Amino acid sequence: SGALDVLQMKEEDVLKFLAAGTHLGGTNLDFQMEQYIYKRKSDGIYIINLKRTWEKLLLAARAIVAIENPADVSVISSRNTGQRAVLKFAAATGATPIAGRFTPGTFTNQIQAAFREPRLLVVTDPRADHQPLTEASYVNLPTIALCNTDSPLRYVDIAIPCNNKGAHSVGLMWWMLAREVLRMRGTISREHPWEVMPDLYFYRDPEE
Amino acid sequence: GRMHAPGKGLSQSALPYRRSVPTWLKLTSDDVKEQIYKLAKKGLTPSQIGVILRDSHGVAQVRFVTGNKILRILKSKGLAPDLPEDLYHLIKKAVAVRKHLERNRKDKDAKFRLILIESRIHRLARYYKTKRVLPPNWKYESSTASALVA
Amino acid sequence: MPLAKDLLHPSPEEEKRKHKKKRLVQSPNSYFMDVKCPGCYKITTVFSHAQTVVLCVGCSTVLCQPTGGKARLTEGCSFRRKQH
Amino acid sequence: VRMNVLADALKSINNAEKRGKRQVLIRPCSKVIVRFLTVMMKHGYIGEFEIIDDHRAGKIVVNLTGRLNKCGVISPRFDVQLKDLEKWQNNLLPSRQFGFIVLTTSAGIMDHEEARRKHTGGKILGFFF
Amino acid sequence: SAKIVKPNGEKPDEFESGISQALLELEMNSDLKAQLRELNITAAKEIEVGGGRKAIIIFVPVPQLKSFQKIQVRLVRELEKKFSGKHVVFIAQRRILPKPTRKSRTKNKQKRPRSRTLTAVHDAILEDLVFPSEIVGKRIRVKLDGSRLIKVHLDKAQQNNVEHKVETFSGVYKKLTGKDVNFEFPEFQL
Amino acid sequence: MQSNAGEFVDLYVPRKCSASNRIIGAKDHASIPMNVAEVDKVTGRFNGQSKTYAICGAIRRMGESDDSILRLAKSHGIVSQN
RNA sequence: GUUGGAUCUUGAGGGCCCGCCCCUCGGCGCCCCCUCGAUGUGUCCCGCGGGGCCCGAAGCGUUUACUUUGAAAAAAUUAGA
């Protein structure tokens, strides 16, 4: 677990969640995400349970920890909103970064113009990062992924409930992940939160 | 499985676990037996008696007050209908279809339907004959079906 | 289902929404109730799915009206099962 | 409707097990089903079961394990005089080192190893391994 | 009048003498006059339980039981006070037609219904122990070990009356049949 | 796979699972475990000593795996906010 | 013609195994006879030997199929000493 009071959440997180529009979900009924759901908003739309979002995020974070090299976890986003997000994560945690197009075959193909060696994949939506998700299960790689109520759950080990499409939702979850892994093993230390704001993540946000 | 109807659905109630219903006022044996005797005097079938007892009185079935059911009471008394209620109502439908068939000799549907109902009577009746609820020396007929319903 | 659940004491909202004979412990949810209703001056016991009307001496006719589902009732009424 | 009850139960478990599902509702529930489940349970092929009681005919919830590979039914039942047991055992089991043929004998529903010791035959119900 | 409460050909005394004297007291006692004045129990038997109080099991031939069950809780409460903590209840024992075997004697039979058989009698005893709640359902859990425990669901309305009783009901059943019973409250009403 | 009283036949002893109680065979794809780090608690900061769960081809292709991991992890502990 | 739902009870000895539970015999006993010890056509220990009647036991209660053990079951052949 860790030192323990702020790993049972705190108001600071609950404010960030609400702001980033995490809480709203899809309108498709569930059979694999159903457990996670707190309550259903009137006339469709599911309110995800922040308590569940926490525990899964921490279990994910913990799995990246106990590797003494953070490079062999590949952070993956093909979404525009999360290109900046993963780039900041890679600076911070020390992940090997994949922003924009994946380009098929880097965990496959003996003869190729690039090859990456991971041990764990972190995905932002496995219906946009579907190519890594399929490719990973041909070569025996576990995949964590940020899943909503209409994402595929096949070949995903650990799902993290969250909207995880667009806006600040993808950004915030990368920020909180980086903060979490640095707590256990980093230089934030002692299981207390980051001094970096989530705004360094998020999207580019069109510059005036 | 149904070979006696073209259905697919259900046609019975769910029934409760317990041998006592409703347990807040189950009345007494006395009350409902009197009521049964008086209703059965009027020539009412066990079905009809069960319905009216259920809703108006605080009994549901009378199987939960005493181990007897409405038929059992009737049968032991010796005041009872002279054939089972289901068999009666089957015979009654086949009469009604037969009357409609007399009226209309172009109604192919009615001919088909009559056959089905008649077959249904025979299989039920065969069951009653074997277990001595009907005499084996009676048999269903156009002739006698009329006489029963009248 | 997520296809590995085992339920030995199932919640009474996923067993109470189902059809009457499809329940995981089968007893129907039907009950009796006492009806007070003001033009009747006696407390008539009525069946929730009565089918045919319940009537009483105290009322002219005002007690039930037939409906294929739950029996219709008129003015002030109460219900307590009691104990099914 | 149901002209064998063993055959439905056995399939139900196997189909659950394929999914990874750890529950089934078998019914109509009979004395023979209970007996078959207990012998099966003892050897570790399935987990524990719980019989729910109704006035319909009963329903059993079996919590199963994936220590089973196949529970087959020999329907229609055949006589076994302890010199067709050998023929069955080579035919329909993968080795003689493991698996049980489960029969009903007059000395009780028992596995065929116990049958061999008693030298009491009867009717073959099924098998598992 | 008690005149049949102690006679049963039992060697004791102690408890039966106590219970018979108690019965006379109750016969005169208010709101229980004119219903024990013609109905006097065949025997009383004492068997202990794990509550550290003894349990008094009274035998009724079935017609008596209806009157005893009517009151139950109030009567049992008075008898518990009188006998200093003993838990009193009422159990019905029928004759029970012989085994469907064959050898070991199968005696005289004529049709044996499933409402007078050994299992039926045990179910009837369970029903008789309770009064303000009924048995909604039952389940038996078969353990992996091979043991069985029967969880008897009771009504979730008026439960309180049976809650304190539970331990004695468990123990008494164990002494009589050699099987443990436990009580539970379901998930029906609500 | 033993022979006799405990003689070793066999080329190797394969991994098992506890999310469906089915062996991971023989060179199969989509078969990997999942080392979650322990944290020592109270003072924070990761201390060893991996908790490992074994995930088979079967569960993953039937899209079970997400829920399964939580059941396995919770049952033997330990994660904050349980 | 084939097939068919649920539902009825049997503690010790030794480190499982055994009998049990929710009259033609043997014999717990009762009565008889040559009587066996109180006795030597004959008792009051008992039916022990022949009896009757009648319990644990047992036809017991209503039948089986099945399965199980026996017999009856050509020699040569055939497996096989």
Swiss-Prot record, chain B:
Gene3D superfamilies: 4.10.860.130, S15/NS1, RNA-binding. The modification N6-acetyllysine is found at K26. InterPro entries: Ribosomal_uS15, Ribosomal_uS15_arc_euk, Ribosomal_uS15_N, uS15_NS1_RNA-bd_sf. Belongs to the universal ribosomal protein uS15 family. This is Small ribosomal subunit protein uS15. The lineage of its organism: Eukaryota, Metazoa, Chordata, Craniata, Vertebrata. There is a cross-link at K42 (Glycyl lysine isopeptide (Lys-Gly) (interchain with G-Cter in SUMO2)). One of its GO terms (cellular component) is cytosolic ribosome. Ubiquitinated at Lys-26 by RNF14 and RNF25 in response to ribosome collisions (ribosome stalling). The modification Phosphotyrosine is found at Y37. There is a cross-link at K26 (Glycyl lysine isopeptide (Lys-Gly) (interchain with G-Cter in ubiquitin)). Component of the small ribosomal subunit. The ribosome is a large ribonucleoprotein complex responsible for the synthesis of proteins in the cell. Part of the small subunit (SSU) processome, first precursor of the small eukaryotic ribosomal subunit. During the assembly of the SSU processome in the nucleolus, many ribosome biogenesis factors, an RNA chaperone and ribosomal proteins associate with the nascent pre-rRNA and work in concert to generate RNA folding, modifications, rearrangements and cleavage as well as targeted degradation of pre-ribosomal RNA by the RNA exosome.
UniProtKB/Swiss-Prot annotation, chain C:
Zn(2+) binds at C37, C40, C56, C59. Binds 1 zinc ion per subunit. One of its GO terms (biological process) is translation. The keyword Transport does not apply. A zinc finger (C4-type) spans 37-59. Residues 1-16 have a biased composition (Basic and acidic residues). It is found in: Cytoplasm; Nucleus, Nucleolus. The modification Phosphoserine is found at S11. The keyword Membrane does not apply. Disulfide bonds: none annotated. Its cofactor is Zn(2+). GO terms for molecular function: structural constituent of ribosome; zinc ion binding. GO terms for cellular component: cytosolic ribosome; cytosolic small ribosomal subunit; nucleolus; postsynaptic density; small-subunit processome. Gene3D superfamilies: Zn-binding ribosomal proteins. Residues 1-23 are annotated as: Disordered. Component of the small ribosomal subunit. The ribosome is a large ribonucleoprotein complex responsible for the synthesis of proteins in the cell. Required for proper rRNA processing and maturation of 18S rRNAs. Part of the small subunit (SSU) processome, first precursor of the small eukaryotic ribosomal subunit. HAMAP family: Ribosomal_eS27. Belongs to the eukaryotic ribosomal protein eS27 family. Component of the small ribosomal subunit. Part of the small subunit (SSU) processome, composed of more than 70 proteins and the RNA chaperone small nucleolar RNA (snoRNA) U3. This is Small ribosomal subunit protein eS27. It comes from Oryctolagus cuniculus (Rabbit). The gene is RPS27.
From Swiss-Prot, chain E:
It comes from the Eukaryota. The keyword Nucleus applies. It is found in: Cytoplasm, Cytoskeleton, Microtubule organizing center, Centrosome; Cytoplasm; Nucleus, Nucleolus. The gene is RPS7. Component of the small ribosomal subunit. Part of the small subunit (SSU) processome, composed of more than 70 proteins and the RNA chaperone small nucleolar RNA (snoRNA) U3. Binds IPO9 with high affinity. Interacts with NEK6. Interacts with DESI2. Interacts with IPO5, IPO7 and KPNB1; these interactions may be involved in RPS7 nuclear import for the assembly of ribosomal subunits. It comes from Oryctolagus cuniculus (Rabbit). The keyword Chloroplast does not apply. InterPro entries: Ribosomal_eS7, Ribosomal_eS7_CS. Keywords: Acetylation, Cytoplasm, Cytoskeleton, Isopeptide bond, Nucleus, Ribonucleoprotein, Ribosomal protein, Ubl conjugation. The modification N6-acetyllysine is found at K70. Phosphorylated by NEK6. Ubiquitinated. Deubiquitinated by DESI2, leading to its stabilization. Component of the small ribosomal subunit. The ribosome is a large ribonucleoprotein complex responsible for the synthesis of proteins in the cell. Required for rRNA maturation. Part of the small subunit (SSU) processome, first precursor of the small eukaryotic ribosomal subunit. GO terms for molecular function: structural constituent of ribosome. PROSITE patterns: RIBOSOMAL_S7E (PS00948). This is Small ribosomal subunit protein eS7. Coiled coil: none annotated. There is a cross-link at K66, K70 (Glycyl lysine isopeptide (Lys-Gly) (interchain with G-Cter in SUMO2)). GO terms for biological process: ribosomal small subunit biogenesis; rRNA processing; translation. Its main location: cytoplasm.
From Swiss-Prot, chain F:
The keyword Endoplasmic reticulum applies. It comes from the Eukaryota. Its main location: cytoplasm. PROSITE patterns: RIBOSOMAL_S21E (PS00996). InterPro entries: Ribosomal_eS21, Ribosomal_eS21_CS, Ribosomal_eS21_sf. It is found in: Cytoplasm, Cytosol; Cytoplasm; Rough endoplasmic reticulum. The modification N-acetylmethionine is found at M1. GO terms for biological process: translation. GO terms for molecular function: structural constituent of ribosome. There is a cross-link at K41 (Glycyl lysine isopeptide (Lys-Gly) (interchain with G-Cter in SUMO2)). Keywords: Acetylation, Cytoplasm, Endoplasmic reticulum, Isopeptide bond, Ribonucleoprotein, Ribosomal protein, Ubl conjugation. Pfam families: Ribosomal_S21e. GO terms for cellular component: cytosolic ribosome; ribonucleoprotein complex; rough endoplasmic reticulum. Belongs to the eukaryotic ribosomal protein eS21 family. Component of the 40S small ribosomal subunit. Component of the small ribosomal subunit. The ribosome is a large ribonucleoprotein complex responsible for the synthesis of proteins in the cell. This is Small ribosomal subunit protein eS21. The gene is RPS21.
